[PDB]
Amino acid sequence: NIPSLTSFAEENNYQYGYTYAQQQLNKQRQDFERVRLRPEQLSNIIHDESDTISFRSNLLKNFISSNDAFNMLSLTTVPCDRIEKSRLFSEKTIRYLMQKQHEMKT
Amino acid sequence: GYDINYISKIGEKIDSNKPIFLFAPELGAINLHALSMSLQSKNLGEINTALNTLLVTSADSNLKISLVKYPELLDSLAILGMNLLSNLSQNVVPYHRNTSDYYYEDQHDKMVDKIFEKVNNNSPAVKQWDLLPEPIRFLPNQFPLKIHRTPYLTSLKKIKDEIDDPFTKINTRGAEDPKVLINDQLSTISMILRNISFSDNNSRIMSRNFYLKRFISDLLWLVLIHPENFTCNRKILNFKKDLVIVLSNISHLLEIASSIDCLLILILVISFGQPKLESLTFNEFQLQWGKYQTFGVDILAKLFSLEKPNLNYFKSILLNNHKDKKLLRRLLNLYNRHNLLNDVVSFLFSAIPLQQVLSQPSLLIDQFSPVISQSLTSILVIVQKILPFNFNKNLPFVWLSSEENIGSGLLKLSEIILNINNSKVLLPSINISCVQLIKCLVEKSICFENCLNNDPEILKKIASIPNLFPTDLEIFQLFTNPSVDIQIINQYQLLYNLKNDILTNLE
Amino acid sequence: YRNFMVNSYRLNPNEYFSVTTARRNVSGDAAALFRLHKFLTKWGLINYQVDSKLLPKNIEPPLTSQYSTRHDAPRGLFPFESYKPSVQLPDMAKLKKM
Amino acid sequence: LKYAPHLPFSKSENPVLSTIAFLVGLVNPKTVQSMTQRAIQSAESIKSQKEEISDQKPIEHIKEGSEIAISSLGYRSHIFATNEERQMNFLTNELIRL
Amino acid sequence: LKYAPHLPFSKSENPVLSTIAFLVGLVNPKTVQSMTQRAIQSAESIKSQ
Amino acid sequence: VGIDTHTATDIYQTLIALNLDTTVNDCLDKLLNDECTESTRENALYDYYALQLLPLQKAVRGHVLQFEWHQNSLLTNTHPNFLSKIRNINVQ
Amino acid sequence: ITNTTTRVIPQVEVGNRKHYLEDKLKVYKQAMNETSEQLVPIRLEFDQDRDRFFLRDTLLWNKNDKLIKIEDFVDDMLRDYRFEDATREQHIDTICQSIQEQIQEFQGNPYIELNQDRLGGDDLRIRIKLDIVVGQNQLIDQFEWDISNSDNCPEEFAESMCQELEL
Amino acid sequence: HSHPSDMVIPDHLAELIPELYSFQQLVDSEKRLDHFIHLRNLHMKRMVAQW
Amino acid sequence: NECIASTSNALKVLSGDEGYNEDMVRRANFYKENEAMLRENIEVILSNGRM
């Protein structure tokens, strides 16, 4: 097949109305461009991450994540002088930067 | 105060069984003429119930919507999408105006009626208007300030950070805001137009439709230059995600109208893919993410096939009727010489998965042969018919030696493809495309050096590519096996004759 | 011209109001009268009920019928609510005071 | 607040005032004296403040107390925001080491 | 009460949030912003010392 | 503390019904007793006419609003994932 | 009828005629370059000899009109005359070629309209005779008509005469 | 669930914490290192097959 | 105020209910600012014969 560019012309094709070579080329045209342009009627209809995203699950997760983070704010009756600060380094990041600074003189 | 996991578990079933709109089996005899006349009715319900009944049928894949039997539905869709793009950039609200909506409700005697205004107390001009408004450019509001080149993955992260926001407005509904009503009419228009274009007759009817080409050149301006009017950030991605699909099916017969559209096509196709932080400015897109960039390398492969207006517009854009001269020269220097050419060629060197098919052997090339073939065709068109003087930087040299060594990747890919078929249709074209691309890149590097004449020591630097230029032993192998072709070994032997002429001219 | 064509169709709606009778009965060129008649019949309004057919009979399932509505039905839309009266004795005193 | 239920004439629970007292009982009272001029600051500044808060309506005390409570909530939210920023810096250092 | 059929507030679950929901209508936001920024700057003046 | 929104809404319904019935019976008595003036008898007779057909007006105000909401059907405001049609790169 | 088994029916037609689909761009390309009209009197006569149809209809036609294809209008007219679908061996091409010839011979309103226009015209009064048959009535009347005046409206005089006679 | 989206620290965190650029161009500095191993492996598959 | 108005609205969508705000459409100034769409919808419902 792989019919033509002349078979795609408007003269050899039907229009809103109101030969043999044309009716032979339009067989191969409709038999080529209906196995090429047909959509996939099976799975892999996900196509990406941002099509199977769920508004209901994210809305439920945000309803939980706002409620518990607001219960963290108001109901935690620890005064501001008593809120102890967290460490800016870990127990492993403080070992690796003692190791690499020891090995930095090479 | 509630246990909202159980409440949402029940409300999912409630939303599933809720009577929102008709399903596919209960639509009855869909009459295309009734839909096409209701879209021109400028009502609100008659437009929306036509759009929904078109969206259900067009996505059904069992009910065909052919435009041979009725070609004026598409003009109604495109004129509606034109007139919605017009009053979105000006923030006019249709469908509920407080204007009257009606026009003039109501010889030798016109001088007698003129003096009748004298003796009772005792020639109208012409009109001019058009069918469609100006596109969306040549408007006083619309002047470019920033080409919104956001990539694919940053758009995905912006979507996932807008949905997972506490104070989100992504579900503010339709009747609570008119701007989201205009946006959800335009998204329905785009979903319909990407659903219609999967037929053999619609793809050639939509190709020869001045209304559809004007609507495409009208939306592609708005989604790239001024996307501030679209409410959500998922609608802006979804317009690009179905404009590329509707341009993938049309472009084999599309004749590009204006040069601004031919630039915005390039920017839209470039906007899929991931750049870096000269050299190749595009990291390779690994296809465990999504095949949406593979649609762009077919738009660029089919729109380069006409030397009529298409390739002339692409040439005048990549190398360099009275206001768009000012618009094109404003858009080209807003895009941050020859950044466009190396961006397009580096993106087309992406989506050829050299690293993935050469890491692990026949399945991946049998799956990705069409995208590889059309990408190599597009790069061959750009190399042979665009690159031959206003350059100031050697582009084929910084493609050949960009620390990724794509020439060695193409040569190993030609080895791989030559070692499967002789030990599944496009592969004899892909072999000759790879070898001719390497040959044309080396020859154009030497020709660009002869034209520019600033870097004399490149004959060493061309011959110092670690896996270019196949040895005489594999060509000795290729001249003995009967399972090889004639043009394959012809391209290989002229690549070797180029290799010998490197070393002769080296000293 | 438009009022003539619309008034002339609606005297006998079973008849296709042709272009030729409209051309023979008002004075004007055939092109503009043909274009106006085709625009008019494009939007209904004339020749809309030339060959009318009868819908035979509808075997109606329940809840798809006139007067098939109950007070027990859920008001998904129809946003006005019916609210539960709270009869609590301190709230009774509050209602008596307020 | 008119439409709030209560225990009438007995069993006085004070949701507004205990909410205000609970919100102000977390926020370091010297900076509460820095927050408003109305609060008691010294034993020499009781009489002038008591004179200057006079001739006010009963709604004014509700307004000022609720303003102080919401401002203390905002201050506590700022402290929690800075602690979360410290947490993000800790996660950044963990990422860099990994 | 403006959000009539959907009230996601519980005295046991959020005692503070319901009273704050009833209280935010009365206050002026400008003085609230002024007092919380004065609290922030006073805390910075203490912490810098 | 300060949470009861719900009982407040219910007794608000009760108090609204109380004040509405107070005004209805006021206009009813002022129209039924002719010891009241006709400018609050016949005025209140037609107040009572307005106090007779008000929730039928709200019923049409609900169904017409429901149909106006039905006009807002676009099928992309609803499920925003309506996957329409795709096709990957073919050998054709 | 909508209550069916969910087919797609494009343009269910009335009077056995597909709906006329306009161009909407040539309409504006013609309606804005719209200097004059130049109506053409067109005569159609056919007999049972040398033709099969009779078709004695007379119509006006705009000569400057480039919108409507003339074969489409003739094909609509033959469908309006209730000719059955064998209407090409009793050709639409014969009537289309007759109407194509009759608008080519129309030399237009001459230099009385083209070059000059004397207000009031000239003394060229011609003796118009007419003989019209409708149903079983025959209108026979003669009058005088200035052919040298441009602002003589035939339609405004025809409506005036049929007003008085109640035609 | 290999999400390609959440490998990006796009703007809002990198403006607040400046070390994230020092993280991100770290990762890119890894991504051209492993690729240098990859062109190494296709080198070592070549020369042995050459010999 | 954005934390409350996006919490009850977060309950209305998860429950499955829809429609206008009940306390907004209960007054009379709603049907005076929306005077345009009501003259359309009343004629549409009356002419179709559903009013």
- Could you write out the DSSP letters of every residue in H3-51? -SGGG---STTTTT-THHHHHHHHHHHHHHHHHHHHHHHHHHHHHHHH-
The interface residues of chain E toward chain A in range 1-20, judged by CB-CB distance below 8 A, are: 14-17, 20
B50 contacts chain A (CB < 8 A):
no
Q: How far is H18 from chain B (nearest CA, A)?
A: 16
Look up tokens 């960009």; give the residue.
B402
Please give the radius of gyration of chain G, using alpha carbons only, rounded to the nearest integer: 21
Answer yes or no: are the C-beta atoms of C94 and D2 closer than 8 Å.
no
Quote the DSSP letter at residue H40: H
Q: For G158, which of C27, C29, C53 is closest by C-beta distance?
A: C27
Alpha-helical regions (H) of B90-177? 110-115, 152-163
Please give the radius of gyration of chain D, using alpha carbons only, rounded to the nearest integer: 20
* Cβ-based contacts of H3 with chain A (< 8 Å): 49
Query: How many Å apart are CA A34 and CA F87, to the nearest integer?
Result: 12
Residue B489 corresponds to which amino acid? I
Among chain C residues, the shortest Cα distance to F12 is held by C95
* Cβ-based contacts of F66 with chain I (< 8 Å): 19
Look up tokens 């995208």; give the residue.
B371
* Cβ-based contacts of C94 with chain D (< 8 Å): 5-6, 8
CB contact under 8 A, C77 and F66: yes
Alpha-helical regions (H) of B308-426? 310-319, 324-333, 339-349, 354-359, 363-385, 395-400, 406-418
Task: Flag whether F touches H (3+ CB pairs, 8 A cutoff).
Answer: no
**Tokens of residue B440, six digits:** 């044309």
Among chain H residues, the shortest Cα distance to D95 is held by H23
DSSP H or E stretch at residue B268: helix B259-270
Answer yes or no: are the C-beta atoms of E6 and I11 closer than 8 Å.
yes
The overall longest dimension of chain D from CA atoms, in Å, is: 65
Answer yes or no: are the C-beta atoms of E45 and D30 closer than 8 Å.
no
CB contact under 8 A, B48 and F77: no
Task: Flag whether G touches B (3+ CB pairs, 8 A cutoff).
Answer: yes
Among chain A residues, the shortest Cα distance to H5 is held by A49
Query: How many Å apart are CA G32 and CA B115, to the nearest integer?
Result: 31
Query: How many Å apart are CA F85 and CA B59, to the nearest integer?
Result: 6
Among chain C residues, the shortest Cα distance to B72 is held by C42
A53 contacts chain B (CB < 8 A):
yes
Answer yes or no: are the C-beta atoms of B304 and B375 closer than 8 Å.
no
CB contact under 8 A, I25 and F64: no
Nearest to F79 by CA among G48, A51, E37: A51
In this complex, which chains have at least 3 CB pairs below 8 Å with chain B? A, C, E, F, G, H, I
Look up tokens 């991931």; give the residue.
B274
Q: How far is H40 from chain D (nearest CA, A)?
A: 25
The interface residues of chain C toward chain G in range 46-85, judged by CB-CB distance below 8 A, are: 47-48, 50-51, 53, 55, 58
CB contact under 8 A, B7 and I15: yes
Look up tokens 């790239």; give the residue.
B224
Method: cryo-EM
Strand, coil or helix: what is B304?
Answer: coil
CB contact under 8 A, C83 and F9: yes
Among chain G residues, the shortest Cα distance to B79 is held by G24
Nearest to F68 by CA among C71, B28, B95, I49: B95
Strand, coil or helix: what is G141?
Answer: strand
Q: How far is H4 from chain B (nearest CA, A)?
A: 6
Nearest to D23 by CA among D73, D86, D97: D73
Answer yes or no: are the C-beta atoms of B264 and B144 closer than 8 Å.
no
Between F and I, how many CB-CB pairs are < 8 A? 20
A79 contacts chain F (CB < 8 A):
no
Best of I14, I21, I34, I40 to mutate (most B CBs within 10 Å, chain B): I14
The dihedrals phi and psi of A43, each to the nearest 5 degrees, come to: -75, -165
The upper half-sphere exposure of residue A49, i.e. CA atoms within 13 Å in the direction of its Cβ, equals: 18
The overall longest dimension of chain A from CA atoms, in Å, is: 94
Please give the radius of gyration of chain C, using alpha carbons only, rounded to the nearest integer: 29
Q: Exposed, middle or buried by CB within 10 Å (0-12, 13-18, 19+), for H2?
A: exposed
Answer yes or no: are the C-beta atoms of B130 and B80 closer than 8 Å.
no
Q: How far is D94 from chain C (nearest CA, A)?
A: 50
Answer yes or no: are the C-beta atoms of E16 and D23 closer than 8 Å.
yes
E31 contacts chain D (CB < 8 A):
yes
The upper half-sphere exposure of residue B288, i.e. CA atoms within 13 Å in the direction of its Cβ, equals: 8
Query: How many Å apart are CA B475 and CA B482, to the nearest integer?
Result: 13
Nearest to D59 by CA among D15, D1, D18, D20: D1
CB contact under 8 A, G60 and C28: yes
Dihedral Cα G93, G98, G100, G103, nearest 10 deg:
-160
Q: Which conformational region is residue G166 in: left (phi greater than 0), alpha (psi within -120 to 50 degrees), or beta? A: left
Between A and E, how many CB-CB pairs are < 8 A? 9
Query: How many Å apart are CA B243 and CA B264, to the nearest integer?
Result: 12
The dihedrals phi and psi of B22, each to the nearest 5 degrees, come to: -65, 150
Answer yes or no: are the C-beta atoms of B247 and B227 closer than 8 Å.
no
Query: How many Å apart are CA B267 and CA C32, to the nearest integer?
Result: 47
Query: How many Å apart are CA B375 and CA B433, to the nearest integer?
Result: 10
Query: How many Å apart are CA B32 and CA B22, to the nearest integer?
Result: 17
Best of D79, D82, D93, D95 to mutate (most A CBs within 10 Å, chain A): D93
Query: How many Å apart are CA F68 and CA B44, to the nearest integer?
Result: 10
CB contact under 8 A, F3 and E20: no
Answer yes or no: are the C-beta atoms of B79 and B193 closer than 8 Å.
no
Best of C5, C29, C57 to mutate (most G CBs within 10 Å, chain G): C29
Nearest to B77 by CA among B186, B235, B217: B186
Pairing of strands G125-134, G58-62: unpaired
Among chain D residues, the shortest Cα distance to H19 is held by D92
The upper half-sphere exposure of residue B28, i.e. CA atoms within 13 Å in the direction of its Cβ, equals: 6
Task: Flag whether B touches I (3+ CB pairs, 8 A cutoff).
Answer: yes
CB contact under 8 A, B37 and C42: yes
Among chain A residues, the shortest Cα distance to F92 is held by A36
In this complex, which chains have at least 3 CB pairs below 8 Å with chain H? A, B, D
Alpha-helical regions (H) of chain D? 15-24, 29-35, 47-52, 58-97
Q: How far is I41 from chain F (nearest CA, A)?
A: 7
Q: Which residues pair with G142 in a beta bridge?
A: G129
Answer yes or no: are the C-beta atoms of B291 and A46 closer than 8 Å.
no
